[PDB]
Amino acid sequence: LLTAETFRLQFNNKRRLRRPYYPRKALLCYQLTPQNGSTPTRGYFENKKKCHAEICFINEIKSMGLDETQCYQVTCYLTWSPCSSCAWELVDFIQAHDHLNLRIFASRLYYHWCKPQQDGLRLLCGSQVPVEVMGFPEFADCWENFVDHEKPLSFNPYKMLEELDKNSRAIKRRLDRIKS
Amino acid sequence: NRWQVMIVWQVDRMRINTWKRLVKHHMYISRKAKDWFYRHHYESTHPKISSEVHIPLGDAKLVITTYWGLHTGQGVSIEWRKKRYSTQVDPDLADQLIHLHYFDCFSESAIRNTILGRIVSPRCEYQAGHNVGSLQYLALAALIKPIKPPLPSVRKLTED
Amino acid sequence: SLQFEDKWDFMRPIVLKLLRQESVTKQQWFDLFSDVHAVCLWDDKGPAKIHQALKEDILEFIKQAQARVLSHQDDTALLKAYIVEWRKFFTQCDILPKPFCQLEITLSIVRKLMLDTWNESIFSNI
Amino acid sequence: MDVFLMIRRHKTTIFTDAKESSTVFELKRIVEGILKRPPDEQRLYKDDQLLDDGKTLGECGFTSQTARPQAPATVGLACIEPFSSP
Amino acid sequence: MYVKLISSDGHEFIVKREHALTSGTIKAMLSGPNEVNFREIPSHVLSKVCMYFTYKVRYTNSSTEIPEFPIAPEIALELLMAANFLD
Amino acid sequence: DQRSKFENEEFFRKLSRECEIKYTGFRDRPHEERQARFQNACRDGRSEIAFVATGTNLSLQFFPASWQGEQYVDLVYLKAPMILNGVCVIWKGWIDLQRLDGMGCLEFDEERAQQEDALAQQAFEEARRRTREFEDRD
RNA sequence: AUUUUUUUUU
RNA sequence: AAAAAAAA
Ligand SMILES: [Zn+2]
Ligand SMILES: [Zn+2]
């Protein structure tokens, strides 16, 4: 799984990134909850060559197998949100599979100033898939979920989480105003 | 070997280009077709699909697919989809199903106002959505004659 | 234009003959159909004024029926009167709703109006 | 597409359908019998040719495109009474 | 079985019962307490109504070609009223 | 009413009449070579084949399964089950036994009609039957 | 490190 | 040259 340093660096939601100029890469943290009683299933994927994180996630969920008549709640925290090709592949996959309630949570928007990306996000919202910006609750959830806290770390996560939540207001407003 | 069979109506380049231009104009420049969708040729993994226009009707949708590399080549296909259930749809029924939700039609109290000579505000400029109905509509259309950029019609694109 | 003035009174004898199972010629039926359409079309205050007129007419007929059956307070007399009156309601619920088809188009309802009037006058009372 | 026809006997304006090349007797066997008239003492007419008596489906074989349900072609029987106008 | 609709001018149009059952007004008018008389519809409009009855009962089943009904506009308005009485 | 719908609606009457079907393709190539390409395309299902119905723009297109995602069809065995206009049908014909031309028509798919889901079918039925005209409140 | 413009401060 | 904010 992830790392505390990896979490704080790769899940940034700011528009500054300070003087150091490490690159931010799209990541997917998916979690499964079935209503039968099985434990939530946790996973994370990167933008492997060609296989964007979303597409990899789709292939993973298709390959690992699940019952068709049991409704499953899937939530994916995407670092960069889905692109237009991913916005269409995910829409098609979620229309094909009826029993999957998909919740996409984006820490920041991917080329939100371009028209096709806005249309893809509107498509995702319209086709039963609610895509919303990360706020403090999901930031904290994916913090204590997808990170091992055994190792020592600097920068108290309390501050980390509050910093991320504070950064995640302008982009929340941008997403709320981007749907039309 | 496994196959999937589906009906493609062969069209030439000019008509497909005109349909794409009209749907793009009314999606963005105009306001009638804002609720539709569009899947460009680079957003799909199908080697032959050049475009896909999605028209959401209620909880279902209508998908119009335009193809790349057929013979005697390209073509247009129409499908009606509702939660993994899909049917082939002819151009006339496609237009009729489109007109049910999107483009303005005569109001409920439109026959009466015309009967007394009163003005009727909401008309029906999408004639292609009406293919036999009732004599009231025929008389009304013969009474009032009902757009500079033509509206997107599936039957005109899928002509010949 | 011409709605409910010199028009509803024209069909009032026809309405009360249609009620109570009184013989009415077909030509009168066609005339009443035309008059109902003209009333519901020319000024459109049909599903309200025709509604009130039909409601008061059916209520008056129900009251007259109660007056004519209270003279038959005997249990056997009450039962036979109820039987013949149920035949009357069957015939009226069959025939009366048809002329007021345009009531549904604008907004039958006369059948359920008669149903609730009979429920209040008879079913609720007895 | 079978031919569609209307017969104008003065006021009466019967409407019916017939085959593309059906004989006149098939036109006036039972179809005219609705008027309670047997084939005897009855003869069809058509414009000015008068159709003679019957059995000749050649001249009576009106083309389908010439007589549509939207605009059926008159026949006549015996004068006709023209329709009124607003 | 053929019904005989009489217009306001006395012009009797005889039509098939299933063709004249298209309009709900006729279907409700006939059954109850044959032949149907009218007080307002003239001959030149009842004729068009019967023509439309035939045209619709013929072309409703068709799904490929639907030829247009030729309606003269100068009378269409009046025709509309008659249609509003029937359909 | 799916079973009855085939016998009267004109679309199926014109579609199911043993229509002549001609393969469209590499007609520019020599006829012997062209029928060789058709044979080797039918041999391994890794291409598309279109039949033009000989007179209309309507064409039946056979694409390989693995072209629109993974999610019976033969190839005298030209069985093509689909759901046309809301009713399950099978386009059946023969073109592969001959060189490059043949016959093709429609037959009812009773098995697919029974196996098809009900809610969406009646939803489409209500969508098709109803008319937009004079429906908006005013 | 997804880009452009605008505003304030040093 | 650097920091913070808003919009596309
Ligand atoms: Zn992507
Ligand atoms: Zn319309």
Numbering used by the authors:
A (entry chain A): 3 to 182
B (entry chain 1): 3 to 74, 82 to 140, 143 to 157, 160 to 173
C (entry chain x): 12 to 118, 133 to 151
D (entry chain y): 1 to 78, 89 to 96
E (entry chain z): 17 to 49, 58 to 111
F (entry chain 0): 7 to 77, 85 to 88, 95 to 157
Task: Provide text from the study.
Human APOBEC3 (A3) cytidine deaminases are antiviral factors that are particularly potent against retroviruses. As a countermeasure, HIV-1 uses a viral infectivity factor (Vif) to target specific human A3s for proteasomal degradation. In this process, Vif adopts a “double-hijack” mechanism by recruiting cellular T-cell transcription cofactor CBF-β and Cullin-5 (CUL5) E3 ubiquitin ligase complex comprising CUL5, Elogin B (ELOB) and C (ELOC), and RING-box protein 2 (RBX2) to induce polyubiquitin chain formation on A3 proteins for subsequent proteasomal degradation. Vif nucleates the entire complex by directly binding four human proteins, A3H, CBF-β, CUL5, and ELOC.
